[PDB]
Design a protein around this ligand. Structure first.
Ligand SMILES: *[C@@H]1O[C@H](CO)[C@@H](O[C@@H]2O[C@H](CO)[C@@H](O)[C@H](O)[C@H]2NC(C)=O)[C@H](O)[C@H]1NC(C)=O
Ligand SMILES: *[C@@H]1O[C@H](CO)[C@@H](O[C@@H]2O[C@H](CO)[C@@H](O)[C@H](O)[C@H]2NC(C)=O)[C@H](O)[C@H]1NC(C)=O
Ligand SMILES: *[C@@H]1O[C@H](CO)[C@@H](O[C@@H]2O[C@H](CO)[C@@H](O)[C@H](O)[C@H]2NC(C)=O)[C@H](O)[C@H]1NC(C)=O
Ligand SMILES: *[C@@H]1O[C@H](CO)[C@@H](O[C@@H]2O[C@H](CO)[C@@H](O)[C@H](O)[C@H]2NC(C)=O)[C@H](O)[C@H]1NC(C)=O
Ligand SMILES: *[C@@H]1O[C@H](CO)[C@@H](O[C@@H]2O[C@H](CO)[C@@H](O)[C@H](O)[C@H]2NC(C)=O)[C@H](O)[C@H]1NC(C)=O
Ligand SMILES: *[C@@H]1O[C@H](CO)[C@@H](O)[C@H](O)[C@H]1NC(C)=O
Lengths: 106, 170, 50
């Protein structure tokens, strides 16, 4: 409706008998392949991303936002637990870091 | 072919030119309408040869290789169910190319989600695309993943009911 | 010639691979929309009879 791509903002310009809209939009570019999974199996529990998607570069698993590649460590703060690992089709095994663990470790 | 009639008709001026120009405008407007509706992608996408979409069946909407017209069963049913100075101009886009455009749109929305509409087509598995759509309407991803078989069965049943309803209603 | 609808692009779909963008382009596009016409008035008596 407001240009090709993900619309950010627009500018109006007067024209003789008309209006010209300058649509400023965000277009994704330089995409890269990653290996993906619906959920992460850890401690017999299934972890799902709160807002992002699980990606793998070949050896390590990360969670990133869907529209830009920004890999982050899979923790309990960006994932939520629902059910065990027996129901979700295609769940893979990976560790889930806990931020609270070094605090009581030290 | 009456020359006397044309000689008398010339007294009325450029009425014929106005009528021809109006009809020409309507005729180009129809092609513009078809261009706006169907030609919304500049890449012709195709589905993978293996139709592994996590249990989701799209046979009724994807093009049939067996048919010479390369139409879907639903599209074939739709085409079957529709039955002095005058000329009919052919449409600029044939039915085959419109079917090809719909095939490209279907392949893009199945294999790439909504990414192809906003830029380059980024591949995503279909049970992840469905989870994203579930998140769009405010339902968590886990609900989709846990009940993926039931949702796939319901979707296939609904598509079959759509084909039956179209085939059974005049 | 017979027209080509678009350049061919086969998306590499598989059940466990995703494509993630690593960059972006800020694209500005133009949309021209007519708003009004010339306001014309015709004196019917003057036009037909003068
Ligand atoms: C996937 O990304 C991770 C994170 O960068 C890579 O792990 C790093 O690999 C480099 C290369 O030897 C090491 O120097 C770093 O110390 C590693 N970081 C961690 C946290 O282990 C990993 O190698 C990448 N895998 C592939 C296949 O590219
Ligand atoms: C992911 O981890 C689970 C649990 O550790 C694995 O499930 C085990 O699989 C072995 C061999 O198939 C069985 O003998 C165990 O009884 C299973 N345990 C449970 C709790 O199910 C699973 O195979 C792992 N997946 C991968 C790909 O390594
Ligand atoms: C997807 O749906 C199609 C259409 O319903 C299935 O094709 C049917 O398969 C059964 C079993 O072989 C046949 O008895 C029907 O006659 C087929 N219907 C048609 C219209 O061909 C197909 O099996 C489903 N699954 C897959 C994986 O394609
Ligand atoms: C992700 O991987 C797929 C598969 O390796 C890539 O698809 C191939 O791209 C090359 C380059 O033009 C083609 O020649 C092959 O025919 C493609 N294969 C298939 C099965 O379509 C894809 O390009 C990769 N994505 C990125 C961003 O590099
Ligand atoms: C993302 O794309 C932008 C293009 O806008 C890249 O910026 C260019 O980077 C090259 C190499 O450093 C420069 O020679 C160009 O002059 C830059 N262009 C502009 C407009 O600044 C940017 O580097 C890309 N980033 C990544 C991570 O790929
Ligand atoms: C993808 O399909 C292959 C078989 O072609 C299967 O082994 C694998 O488990 C599937 N992965 C997912 C996530 O469904």
């Amino acid at each position: 409706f407001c240009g090709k791509g993900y619309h950010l903002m627009s500018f109006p310009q007067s024209a003789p008998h008309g209006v010209v809209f300058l649509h400023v939009t965000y277009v994704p570019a330089q995409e890269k392949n990653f290996t993906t999974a619906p959920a992460i199996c850890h401690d017999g529990k299934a972890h799902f991303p709160r807002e992002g998607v699980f990606v793998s570069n070949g050896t390590h698993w990360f969670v990133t936002q869907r529209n830009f590649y920004e890999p982050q460590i899979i923790t309990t703060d960006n994932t939520f637990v629902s059910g065990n690992c027996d129901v979700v089709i295609g769940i893979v095994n990976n560790t889930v870091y806990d931020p609270l663990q070094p605090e009581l470790d030290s | 072919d009456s020359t006397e009639c044309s000689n008398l008709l010339l007294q009325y001026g450029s009425f014929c030119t106005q009528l021809n120009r109006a009809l020409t405008g309507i005729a180009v407007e129809q092609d513009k309408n078809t261009q706006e509706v169907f030609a919304q992608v500049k890449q012709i996408y195709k589905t993978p040869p293996i139709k592994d979409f996590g249990g989701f069946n799209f046979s009724q909407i994807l093009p049939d290789p067996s048919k010479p017209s390369k139409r879907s069963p639903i599209e074939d049913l739709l085409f079957n169910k529709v039955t002095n100075g005058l000329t009919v101009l052919p449409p600029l886009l044939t039915d085959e190319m419109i079917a090809q455009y719909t095939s490209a749109l279907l392949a893009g929305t199945i294999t790439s989600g909504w990414t192809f509409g906003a830029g380059p087509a980024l591949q995503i598995p279909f049970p992840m695309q469905m989870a994203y759509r579930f998140n769009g309407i405010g339902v968590t991803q886990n609900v989709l993943y846990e009940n993926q078989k039931l949702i796939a069965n319901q979707f296939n049943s609904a598509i079959g009911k759509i084909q039956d309803s179209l085939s059974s209603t005049p | 010639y017979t027209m080509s609808l678009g350049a061919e692009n086969s998306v590499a779909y598989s059940n466990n691979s995703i494509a993630i963008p690593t960059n972006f382009t800020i694209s500005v596009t133009t949309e021209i929309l007519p708003v009004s016409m010339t306001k014309t008035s015709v004196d019917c008596t003057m036009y037909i009879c003068g």
